[PDB]
Amino acid sequence: ERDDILLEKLNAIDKKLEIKLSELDHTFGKKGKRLEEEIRELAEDRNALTEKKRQPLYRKGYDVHVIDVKKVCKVTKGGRVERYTALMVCGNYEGIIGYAKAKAETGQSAMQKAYEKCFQNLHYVERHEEHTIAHAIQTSYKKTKLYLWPAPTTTGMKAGRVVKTILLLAGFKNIKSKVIGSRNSYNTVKAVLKALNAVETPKDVQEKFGRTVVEK
Amino acid sequence: GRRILNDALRTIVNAERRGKASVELKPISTVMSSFLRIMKEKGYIKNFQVYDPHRVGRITVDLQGRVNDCKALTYRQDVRAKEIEKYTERTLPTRQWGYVVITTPDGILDHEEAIKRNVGGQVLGFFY
Amino acid sequence: QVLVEGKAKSRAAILNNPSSLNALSAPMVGRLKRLYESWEENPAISFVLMKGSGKTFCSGADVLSLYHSINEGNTEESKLFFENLYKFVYLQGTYLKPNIAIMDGVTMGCGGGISLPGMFRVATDKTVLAHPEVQIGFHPDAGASYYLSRLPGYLGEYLALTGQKLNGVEMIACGLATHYCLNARLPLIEERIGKLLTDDPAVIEDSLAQYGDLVYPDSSSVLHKIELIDKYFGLDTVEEIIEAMENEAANSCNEWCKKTLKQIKEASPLSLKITLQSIREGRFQTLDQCLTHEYRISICGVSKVVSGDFCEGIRARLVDKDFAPKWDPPRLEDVSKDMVDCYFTPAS
Amino acid sequence: VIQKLLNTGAHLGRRAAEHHFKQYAYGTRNGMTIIDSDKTLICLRSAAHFVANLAHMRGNIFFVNTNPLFDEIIELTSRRIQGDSYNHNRAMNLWKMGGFLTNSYSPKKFRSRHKKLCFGPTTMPDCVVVFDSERKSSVILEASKLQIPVVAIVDPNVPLEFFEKITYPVPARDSVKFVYLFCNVITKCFVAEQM
Amino acid sequence: GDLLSKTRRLVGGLATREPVWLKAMEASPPPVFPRSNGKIQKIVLPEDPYVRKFANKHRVYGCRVLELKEHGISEGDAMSVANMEYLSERKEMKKAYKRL
RNA sequence: UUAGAUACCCUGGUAGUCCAUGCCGUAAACGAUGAGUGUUCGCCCUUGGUCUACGCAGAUCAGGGGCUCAGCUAACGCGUGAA
RNA sequence: GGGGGGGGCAAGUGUUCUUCGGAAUGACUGGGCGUAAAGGGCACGUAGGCGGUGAAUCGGGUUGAAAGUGAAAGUCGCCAAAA
């Protein structure tokens, strides 16, 4: 059905290309008697062509991961302008974690206006044994720093809130982590992202010789 | 530990992340030659041809392109053989890897060779 | 110790001994066997590679050591050398993953024997190949009776018996070399081949043919060697070939037949029989049975030295001097029709 | 080899020093730098192969040019060849400009088509192939954004912010000969290829 | 990850669905070269120190200094006989190019 | 001059400025950037040395000054570092 | 503030005092000092720290092994009884 409607929209846009190419290539002569149709069918092309990039909003362009949210209230001062900013994080418990950030005019509207963009710009994290991370690592954003140490299988998640709700639905279960410096939100996000993407698992460390045993 | 050592190691690291592939270090040393070789046969470089055994000083090291932060210690400190199991936890990736390099009476080791031979000495460098 | 270079997904077990010209000993071949039996069941490694040293790729098989270790009379000291070269080359053939080999030096004797039964083979201008074991008293051994038996009409019976040079252009023309390159720009393809995180051969072949087969321009290599040979080496028995060549102590092309005459005369007579006991038999069998085929011959013509001289070649060629030693008490004139089966007995 | 003779005749390996890369220069001649023409040819091998393979799935290509010296050389292609659309070839004639390749599904509705063209076609080009100096930068940026591979001619003049996020660089270096037939190689390709 | 391997890891860990250029992208890797240092060597024709000083006088010597270096292994100051030969070739060539 | 004027505006005008020797010992004593050593993509300059010159510069040192690849920085920005 | 209703704890609850953590808020582990607090006006030089190479020797530091001691209680592992 997906391909059905895709090529169908393509049929629409192909009749668009046809007639509008014809009209364009008739530049020569009297003006109105082609421009009327010009405007009509181009407006039609708009209505149809934008529905492709419309689709991602609700049904597809929407997987079955889970999402979580952030939000604050920016300002402009032409009079006393007020708006809303909001953040979202998608994750599937296997580790595909992604996020997104966008603005709107009211809370639920901003939550929404990201609810269909969190599913783009995806980065894929490699959770070592389905419960924890491959090693210890420090990683810093501009002025937020981060420390990741694994734990053996039974402790549990020892992290904060903004970092817990990422290491949770990435698929980790026994990480201990320390974020230090700025206690901001959107830097801890993208700090976790600049961090987890930094771990080089033994698959990676086989960047040179040596099969790295696990100690059994 | 000296500072010409720190110098050799940092010149290595900075040439690496600059992207050149073959460098030359003027003030050479035996503890530095040993360390270049140690890195080599642990994998981190490609050739380490020292030139003048005496009286002049020149090494030409040609490099692979691995991570290599490898800070070279300055303030001496002991290392027994049974203390590495906890001391090499203060490298960058505390758990996984990096080879704290130790000096012994039986030649300059790394921490694997050390904890095998059950010999000690003094720390000199790191690996990441 | 053999030089294991472990790049990302391209391990390469480069045996070497630049004092022994990159010759081969039982330890070296056995260690390579260990490496390959380990690598076969490995998800990490993708393919395997074969290199040498700065001078040459492969030269000799320590048969000097084998005479010095057979003048005493221990069966196993030689039977094991040969068993673990044979089963080695069988493995070489039977491996689950691609096998690249490089050639620049004087690959000789068993030189190509390790390499060719793999996937790909890169040559160089100064690659120079021959198989003078008939000139030690021995035979082209361990699958040479495969990768030469399969060849243009009566051309393997040129190569093995006489033992002429096989250089780069020659091997890319005659398909002995799968690809060709230049010396100073070989690591150029080495890193290209190493960094690839790819599995199926169908794409490594393309990535290497990038810098693989790009010159076939020969105008004097085998231009008419083919039909020069189709007159003589298309006969039945070595002595008939050479008698027709004595008839071809000719007038026009003689500057060709004279030198091949001498090149053959530099070889033992019964061994000049075993080379045809090799090819004109293995031109239709596979490699593990052409392997055991030469295996019985190798174990026999060393212990059961009854008419050839397996040790005088060793004693002269290297030890004394490359003067033709007296490997020919019964020259080809009187070589029993059953001398070759007196070698080839344990066919059972 | 003989092809290297031909490249060397093609006034190509030599171009003034405005460089960030040196993996390429055979030397210099004080008014030129000589790149490694064998590397030139090897780059051509790889990229042309890539396009002739992408063929085997028939994915849209959408060349890009803005310096109309090649205009004729290129226009012999992209119409009845490759993309096959002469009408789109007219977009390419007068394109690269506006909201591009990432907000491709823009309205753009307002024409008032007085001595304007205003094409605005829309479909994901699964690979890009360009050749000009710098005005086209939007295509490179947006391709790198949306993970679209690119083939591009790079002279010594290329900032790192392009030279490193464009795959498949053809360091051809157009120079004293200016624009000469090159694209006829990719003309060979994709035609008498798709079987 | 790099533009070529990022995408592979992505699709393998099943982030997004496959692009239509992947099988060909891997089949035609990018043309990498050995990582070399700075120092673009100044490369020179062996016959530099005289063409500069001779085109001063009067292309063809820009390569005929080779046909002079060939005997240059025992050349004392054969610059004079070289410029003489150049006089000869120019004399005859311009006789011809005025007869045309 | 102003509501008023210790002021700014005008005209006078000593101490002070200057020299000799002494005393203080402070300034936004401000590249608001301690001192030193090694490694770093270039271009533009430029003060004074050096080598090489054959139409003309090319090279090499010490400095002083912009502009930049990268690197860093909360932000500006520096990059003879604030790498 | 009063009436009702509900949460958290529970023979205990709540306030204050008291000390640590959070507090990287004295940063050895675990900072800074251009514009935010913080580079001295500048140097000299005393201790003091730290600081080239290769060859030799000694064995103080260093380091390998043994015994003595490092009270018992305590922390901790196990074990068992005890509720």
Side-chain angles (χ1 to χ4, degrees):
Chain A
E1 290 75 2
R2 325 192 174 133
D3 67 335
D4 291 18
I5 190 62
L6 185 54
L7 183 44
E8 199 75 9
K9 294 191 175 177
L10 291 183
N11 306 105
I13 300 149
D14 296 354
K15 189 84 210 92
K16 297 304 152 33
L17 71 83
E18 183 69 27
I19 318 165
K20 310 308 259 195
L21 285 172
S22 86
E23 298 176 30
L24 161 62
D25 68 54
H26 181 277
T27 174
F28 201 92
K30 188 50 74 70
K31 314 210 63 183
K33 285 71 185 172
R34 52 89 198 164
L35 69 83
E36 307 109 2
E37 298 296 298
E38 176 184 359
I39 313 151
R40 299 292 97 87
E41 300 150 281
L42 61 86
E44 310 294 88
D45 178 26
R46 304 304 177 259
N47 283 13
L49 72 85
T50 41
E51 285 204 5
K52 260 178 306 174
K53 87 160 177 191
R54 277 182 182 102
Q55 299 214 350
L57 80 166
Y58 274 133
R59 294 317 95 211
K60 206 32 78 177
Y62 165 72
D63 295 17
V64 285
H65 318 156
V66 305
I67 328 293
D68 292 293
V69 65
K70 281 82 196 171
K71 183 190 183 69
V72 192
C73 50
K74 72 190 185 82
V75 161
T76 313
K77 189 67 165 208
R80 188 53 181 271
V81 177
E82 289 280 359
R83 306 203 181 262
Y84 266 90
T85 171
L87 182 70
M88 286 276 216
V89 285
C90 73
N92 74 344
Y93 294 92
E94 200 174 359
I96 316 287
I97 307 293
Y99 70 99
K101 165 179 185 61
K103 317 198 286 193
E105 258 180 8
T106 305
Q108 45 273 16
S109 181
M111 285 196 279
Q112 285 282 320
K113 204 184 188 75
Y115 191 96
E116 50 268 27
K117 200 36 75 185
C118 43
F119 300 135
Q120 286 65 33
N121 169 259
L122 267 195
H123 299 252
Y124 150 74
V125 58
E126 42 268 39
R127 56 199 192 93
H128 189 254
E129 282 315 308
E130 169 77 352
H131 80 112
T132 205
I133 208 172
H135 62 92
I137 177 60
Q138 154 266 332
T139 312
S140 76
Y141 198 34
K142 282 246 183 173
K143 268 215 162 71
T144 319
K145 296 177 42 194
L146 201 43
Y147 291 98
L148 319 185
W149 292 30
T153 74
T154 315
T155 68
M157 270 318 295
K158 186 59 70 177
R161 188 201 78 192
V162 54
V163 54
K164 161 182 290 196
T165 65
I166 313 298
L167 310 167
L168 186 154
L169 50 82
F172 301 99
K173 290 139 164 58
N174 286 98
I175 290 305
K176 296 171 76 169
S177 274
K178 190 72 171 171
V179 54
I180 204 151
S182 64
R183 302 269 305 279
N184 189 13
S185 298
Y186 184 72
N187 289 338
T188 45
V189 183
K190 170 155 50 175
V192 180
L193 265 294
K194 199 174 187 195
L196 311 190
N197 283 40
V199 167
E200 300 194 338
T201 206
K203 281 80 169 182
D204 313 303
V205 76
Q206 282 149 348
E207 195 268 353
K208 187 101 194 303
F209 53 69
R211 284 81 57 87
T212 73
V213 310
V214 68
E215 295 288 328
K216 281 75 68 176
Chain B
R2 302 150 174 148
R3 291 193 297 274
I4 297 162
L5 261 299
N6 189 11
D7 177 77
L9 262 63
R10 272 289 99 170
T11 319
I12 289 173
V13 184
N14 281 3
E16 291 278 5
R17 80 185 60 260
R18 194 45 181 188
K20 309 168 207 297
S22 283
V23 204
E24 54 206 275
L25 318 178
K26 199 63 167 275
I28 69 174
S29 299
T30 173
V31 192
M32 172 214 294
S33 160
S34 157
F35 206 95
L36 297 180
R37 191 187 48 264
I38 280 183
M39 303 181 79
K40 187 78 64 192
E41 280 82 2
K42 298 297 188 171
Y44 282 26
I45 44 174
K46 183 193 103 195
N47 183 286
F48 80 114
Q49 38 202 347
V50 182
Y51 277 33
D52 214 309
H54 307 304
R55 175 258 177 187
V56 179
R58 191 157 89 175
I59 286 169
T60 52
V61 52
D62 312 332
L63 51 88
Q64 161 177 0
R66 309 204 66 199
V67 53
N68 301 95
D69 82 331
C70 75
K71 284 200 194 191
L73 263 282
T74 65
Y75 71 111
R76 70 204 291 239
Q77 86 166 0
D78 49 25
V79 56
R80 186 174 291 176
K82 72 166 299 301
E83 87 191 65
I84 283 178
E85 54 85 17
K86 48 166 180 167
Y87 165 57
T88 180
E89 179 152 350
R90 270 85 174 101
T91 65
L92 300 84
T94 69
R95 272 139 186 82
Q96 58 188 358
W97 49 64
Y99 316 97
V100 180
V101 160
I102 169 184
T103 178
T104 71
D106 298 6
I108 308 193
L109 302 184
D110 307 354
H111 72 294
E112 51 274 54
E113 328 172 6
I115 318 163
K116 284 177 186 309
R117 274 193 202 73
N118 213 356
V119 191
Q122 286 159 192
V123 61
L124 286 181
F126 269 44
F127 270 158
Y128 202 40
Chain C
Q1 290 297 108
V2 303
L3 291 66
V4 169
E5 51 160 30
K7 284 192 197 48
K9 318 296 287 192
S10 320
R11 268 73 165 176
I14 321 309
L15 76 168
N16 253 318
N17 180 343
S19 54
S20 82
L21 291 69
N22 203 325
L24 287 78
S25 80
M28 312 159 90
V29 290
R31 174 153 158 80
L32 266 65
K33 176 76 175 68
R34 184 141 301 99
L35 291 201
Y36 271 55
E37 50 85 16
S38 50
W39 294 4
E40 203 155 29
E41 195 274 308
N42 182 18
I45 186 60
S46 78
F47 53 86
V48 309
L49 171 54
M50 285 299 180
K51 281 275 287 186
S53 66
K55 37 175 292 170
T56 191
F57 158 83
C58 197
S59 43
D62 282 333
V63 175
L64 71 94
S65 71
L66 203 47
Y67 169 63
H68 301 182
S69 81
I70 213 65
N71 76 83
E72 42 77 25
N74 193 345
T75 67
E76 303 320 325
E77 274 192 345
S78 43
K79 182 167 180 175
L80 293 161
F81 182 108
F82 288 119
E83 204 282 343
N84 303 64
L85 171 66
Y86 280 127
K87 215 63 185 183
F88 178 80
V89 189
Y90 155 71
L91 165 71
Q92 160 75 252
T94 198
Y95 198 77
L96 293 156
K97 297 175 174 188
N99 314 275
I100 294 198
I102 311 306
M103 270 173 280
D104 204 323
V106 51
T107 179
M108 190 71 80
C110 47
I114 43 160
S115 88
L116 266 79
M119 302 315 178
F120 304 96
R121 270 75 58 186
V122 172
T124 61
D125 72 325
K126 304 153 192 180
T127 306
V128 285
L129 175 49
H131 311 272
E133 307 94 344
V134 68
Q135 301 174 12
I136 321 173
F138 209 56
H139 41 76
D141 44 354
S145 74
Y146 197 103
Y147 69 86
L148 314 172
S149 87
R150 272 63 170 175
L151 198 65
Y154 294 111
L155 195 60
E157 288 104 2
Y158 173 90
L159 306 187
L161 289 66
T162 82
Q164 185 53 44
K165 293 179 179 179
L166 274 304
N167 290 23
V169 289
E170 199 151 1
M171 296 173 314
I172 47 180
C174 320
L176 196 151
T178 72
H179 310 282
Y180 180 78
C181 81
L182 301 85
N183 170 41
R185 305 153 183 186
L186 172 67
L188 180 59
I189 201 155
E190 214 180 57
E191 56 167 9
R192 286 176 93 203
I193 213 74
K195 52 193 58 185
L196 269 196
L197 186 58
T198 190
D199 55 356
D200 66 78
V203 51
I204 180 170
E205 52 191 24
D206 319 331
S207 44
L208 55 90
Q210 285 272 108
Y211 191 72
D213 44 1
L214 70 161
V215 294
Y216 292 166
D218 305 345
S219 155
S220 314
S221 71
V222 303
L223 83 169
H224 196 75
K225 306 296 183 304
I226 317 299
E227 298 78 18
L228 269 180
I229 282 153
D230 294 0
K231 195 146 53 186
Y232 292 103
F233 301 105
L235 297 155
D236 182 289
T237 292
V238 49
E239 195 39 72
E240 170 202 22
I241 316 171
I242 301 173
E243 274 194 13
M245 286 171 66
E246 294 147 24
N247 171 37
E248 207 64 21
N251 307 117
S252 173
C253 74
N254 44 2
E255 291 176 354
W256 187 85
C257 295
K258 290 283 172 310
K259 50 193 189 201
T260 75
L261 270 154
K262 177 262 297 183
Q263 197 175 82
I264 282 285
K265 287 176 184 175
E266 211 177 82
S268 177
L270 184 41
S271 313
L272 274 166
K273 285 266 166 167
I274 75 187
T275 170
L276 285 85
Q277 184 187 347
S278 62
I279 308 190
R280 306 203 188 277
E281 300 173 8
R283 250 172 164 266
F284 298 104
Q285 295 186 285
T286 180
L287 187 47
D288 65 312
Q289 278 86 22
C290 290
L291 175 89
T292 313
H293 159 263
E294 291 298 327
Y295 154 63
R296 299 319 264 177
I297 309 307
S298 42
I299 177 60
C300 83
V302 294
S303 195
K304 193 190 183 294
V305 163
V306 54
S307 171
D309 286 310
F310 171 70
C311 317
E312 265 163 356
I314 296 143
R315 177 61 202 273
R317 296 281 184 171
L318 302 194
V319 192
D320 189 328
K321 189 178 76 71
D322 196 336
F323 92 93
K326 292 81 67 183
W327 27 250
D328 54 320
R331 289 162 193 77
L332 310 97
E333 43 196 18
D334 49 353
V335 285
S336 159
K337 177 57 185 53
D338 71 3
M339 283 179 185
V340 299
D341 190 275
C342 190
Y343 286 168
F344 181 54
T345 80
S348 314
Chain D
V1 193
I2 302 103
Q3 288 196 358
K4 290 189 281 286
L5 185 143
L6 301 156
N7 311 324
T8 49
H11 299 235
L12 197 61
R14 316 187 174 176
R15 184 53 240 182
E18 49 197 6
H19 44 104
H20 195 200
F21 54 85
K22 302 170 168 190
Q23 320 159 358
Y24 301 67
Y26 188 79
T28 171
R29 281 136 155 270
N30 216 345
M32 303 292 176
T33 80
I34 177 56
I35 86 176
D36 222 346
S37 317
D38 46 4
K39 289 177 174 172
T40 312
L41 207 172
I42 287 172
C43 306
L44 270 192
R45 281 178 202 163
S46 175
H49 175 233
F50 176 45
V51 168
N53 307 128
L54 178 64
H56 263 285
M57 306 148 75
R58 283 99 162 108
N60 36 7
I61 297 100
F62 183 64
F63 286 56
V64 179
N65 173 9
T66 44
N67 188 6
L69 304 184
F70 310 82
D71 209 320
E72 305 96 9
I73 285 175
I74 178 173
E75 82 193 47
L76 173 61
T77 73
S78 85
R79 72 204 332 164
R80 293 182 183 174
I81 305 189
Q82 299 146 189
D84 184 1
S85 187
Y86 87 90
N87 284 308
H88 291 329
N89 168 300
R90 297 324 305 242
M92 297 172 190
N93 278 38
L94 272 304
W95 192 223
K96 168 270 157 182
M97 316 319 191
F100 204 83
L101 258 289
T102 66
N103 206 22
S104 67
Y105 306 86
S106 167
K108 211 170 304 280
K109 55 177 280 163
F110 154 62
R111 304 291 185 197
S112 54
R113 272 175 184 187
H114 163 273
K115 198 176 175 179
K116 289 292 186 166
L117 275 67
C118 298
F119 289 98
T122 169
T123 297
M124 295 296 173
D126 308 1
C127 275
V128 180
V129 177
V130 317
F131 29 82
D132 195 331
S133 187
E134 282 289 347
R135 185 56 159 180
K136 58 193 183 301
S137 293
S138 65
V139 313
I140 301 102
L141 169 59
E142 299 161 351
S144 62
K145 301 300 282 287
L146 209 47
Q147 295 92 16
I148 306 314
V150 54
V151 157
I153 190 179
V154 301
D155 290 359
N157 189 7
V158 55
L160 169 139
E161 191 74 32
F162 302 179
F163 180 42
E164 309 295 344
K165 71 192 50 48
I166 77 180
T167 80
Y168 298 120
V170 54
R173 323 312 168 85
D174 289 345
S175 65
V176 155
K177 204 170 192 307
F178 310 123
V179 316
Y180 72 126
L181 302 174
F182 153 66
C183 272
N184 308 65
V185 190
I186 299 291
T187 314
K188 273 193 212 161
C189 317
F190 203 98
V191 171
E193 169 277 330
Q194 41 187 353
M195 326 311 306
Chain E
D2 63 70
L3 279 57
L4 200 173
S5 159
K6 189 60 180 147
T7 68
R8 267 179 289 124
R9 144 190 312 161
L10 269 294
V11 310
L14 165 80
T16 76
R17 302 160 211 177
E18 188 157 15
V20 203
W21 49 269
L22 189 39
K23 280 185 210 164
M25 181 72 214
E26 55 194 343
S28 310
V32 76
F33 323 106
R35 184 176 65 192
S36 199
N37 306 349
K39 171 216 54 61
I40 315 166
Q41 179 83 287
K42 168 68 187 83
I43 206 62
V44 290
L45 271 291
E47 49 97 26
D48 277 339
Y50 302 122
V51 287
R52 324 180 58 210
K53 308 181 100 191
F54 187 104
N56 181 16
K57 320 177 166 185
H58 305 109
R59 177 193 73 96
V60 311
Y61 200 46
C63 45
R64 173 146 174 70
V65 192
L66 271 305
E67 203 146 318
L68 272 297
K69 174 169 288 177
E70 70 92 30
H71 87 76
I73 310 297
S74 172
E75 177 176 1
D77 197 337
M79 186 192 207
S80 88
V81 307
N83 197 25
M84 182 62 74
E85 301 143 12
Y86 194 74
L87 282 168
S88 65
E89 303 180 81
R90 192 177 182 271
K91 274 162 186 177
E92 310 189 35
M93 82 172 272
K94 267 202 159 178
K95 289 166 197 175
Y97 281 166
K98 269 142 176 168
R99 158 176 180 237
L100 294 198

XYZ file of all heavy atoms in Angstrom, chain C residues 185 188 192 206 209-212 214-215, chain D residues 1 4 26 36 38-39 42 45-46 49:
171
model
N 54.795 0.544 -5.737
C 53.386 0.868 -5.604
C 52.553 -0.378 -5.320
O 51.376 -0.450 -5.683
C 52.914 1.600 -6.858
C 53.773 2.833 -7.160
C 53.818 3.207 -8.639
N 54.706 4.349 -8.878
C 54.859 4.964 -10.050
N 54.182 4.556 -11.116
N 55.692 5.991 -10.158
N 50.605 0.296 -2.003
C 49.451 1.064 -2.441
C 48.209 0.191 -2.515
O 47.132 0.593 -2.063
C 49.746 1.697 -3.796
C 48.620 2.536 -4.387
C 48.271 3.647 -3.442
C 49.034 3.104 -5.733
N 44.923 -0.837 0.503
C 43.605 -0.899 -0.117
C 42.942 -2.234 0.161
O 41.730 -2.306 0.392
C 43.740 -0.684 -1.625
C 44.028 0.744 -2.037
C 44.241 0.840 -3.533
N 43.011 1.169 -4.239
C 42.796 0.901 -5.520
N 43.728 0.290 -6.239
N 41.646 1.243 -6.079
N 36.983 -6.953 -7.575
C 36.833 -5.680 -8.265
C 37.730 -4.614 -7.657
O 38.377 -3.845 -8.377
C 35.374 -5.230 -8.210
C 34.405 -6.377 -8.418
O 34.766 -7.340 -9.121
O 33.278 -6.314 -7.883
N 41.230 -5.468 -8.866
C 41.351 -5.241 -10.298
C 41.339 -3.762 -10.629
O 41.796 -3.375 -11.710
C 40.229 -5.963 -11.042
N 40.804 -2.937 -9.725
C 41.108 -1.513 -9.736
C 42.561 -1.314 -10.125
O 42.879 -0.595 -11.077
C 40.843 -0.915 -8.352
C 39.384 -0.712 -7.981
C 38.844 0.640 -8.416
O 38.052 0.735 -9.353
N 39.261 1.693 -7.722
N 43.449 -2.002 -9.423
C 44.874 -1.966 -9.685
C 45.393 -3.384 -9.862
O 46.367 -3.807 -9.240
C 45.585 -1.225 -8.560
C 47.029 -0.899 -8.853
C 47.357 0.084 -9.772
C 48.061 -1.549 -8.192
C 48.671 0.401 -10.047
C 49.381 -1.238 -8.458
C 49.677 -0.257 -9.390
O 50.978 0.079 -9.678
N 44.700 -4.159 -10.693
C 45.068 -5.542 -10.938
C 45.601 -5.808 -12.332
O 46.777 -5.569 -12.616
N 46.059 -4.800 -15.856
C 45.998 -3.610 -16.698
C 47.057 -3.570 -17.797
O 47.102 -2.587 -18.547
C 46.100 -2.334 -15.839
C 47.393 -1.927 -15.128
C 47.339 -0.452 -14.780
C 47.605 -2.741 -13.866
N 47.902 -4.595 -17.929
C 48.901 -4.664 -18.993
C 49.051 -6.114 -19.454
O 49.324 -7.007 -18.646
C 50.265 -4.080 -18.538
C 50.175 -2.582 -18.274
C 50.773 -4.775 -17.291
N 48.397 3.292 -18.931
C 49.739 3.553 -19.420
C 49.669 4.496 -20.610
O 50.033 5.666 -20.519
C 50.446 2.254 -19.784
C 51.928 2.499 -19.993
C 50.218 1.226 -18.696
N 47.655 7.043 -19.573
C 48.404 8.050 -18.832
C 49.082 9.021 -19.783
O 49.139 10.223 -19.515
C 49.430 7.389 -17.909
C 48.823 6.651 -16.727
C 49.899 6.226 -15.745
C 50.639 4.989 -16.212
N 49.800 3.768 -16.049
N 52.851 15.046 -7.406
C 54.101 14.455 -7.858
C 55.268 15.404 -7.634
O 56.415 14.960 -7.527
C 53.972 14.090 -9.339
C 55.105 13.293 -9.935
C 55.198 11.923 -9.729
C 56.064 13.900 -10.731
C 56.221 11.181 -10.290
C 57.096 13.167 -11.296
C 57.170 11.806 -11.068
O 58.191 11.068 -11.623
N 49.263 13.093 -9.080
C 49.631 11.750 -9.523
C 48.535 11.255 -10.462
O 47.453 10.845 -10.027
C 49.848 10.832 -8.326
C 51.061 9.939 -8.496
O 51.566 9.833 -9.629
O 51.541 9.370 -7.498
N 48.150 8.674 -12.178
C 47.678 7.325 -11.906
C 46.609 7.334 -10.823
O 45.609 6.617 -10.925
C 48.859 6.442 -11.523
C 49.757 7.106 -10.522
O 49.400 8.216 -10.086
O 50.819 6.541 -10.193
N 46.784 8.159 -9.788
C 45.723 8.307 -8.797
C 44.479 8.923 -9.420
O 43.360 8.520 -9.097
C 46.206 9.144 -7.614
C 47.203 8.427 -6.738
C 47.704 9.319 -5.622
C 48.595 8.555 -4.662
N 49.230 9.467 -3.683
N 42.791 6.190 -11.106
C 42.249 5.223 -10.164
C 40.956 5.742 -9.556
O 39.981 4.993 -9.387
C 43.307 4.897 -9.100
C 44.399 4.027 -9.725
C 42.670 4.215 -7.907
C 45.588 3.793 -8.843
N 38.369 5.185 -11.996
C 37.988 3.780 -11.966
C 36.921 3.549 -10.913
O 35.820 3.073 -11.210
C 39.213 2.905 -11.686
C 40.112 2.655 -12.888
C 41.331 1.815 -12.522
N 42.414 1.995 -13.485
C 43.682 1.653 -13.271
N 44.037 1.096 -12.121
N 44.597 1.864 -14.211
N 37.227 3.933 -9.677
C 36.315 3.665 -8.570
C 34.962 4.324 -8.790
O 33.918 3.670 -8.705
C 36.917 4.140 -7.255
O 35.975 3.973 -6.211
N 32.962 3.100 -11.822
C 32.416 1.804 -11.452
C 31.186 1.977 -10.581
O 30.155 1.350 -10.822
C 33.466 0.966 -10.729
C 32.935 -0.331 -10.205
N 33.088 -0.724 -8.893
C 32.248 -1.322 -10.817
C 32.523 -1.904 -8.720
N 32.003 -2.289 -9.872
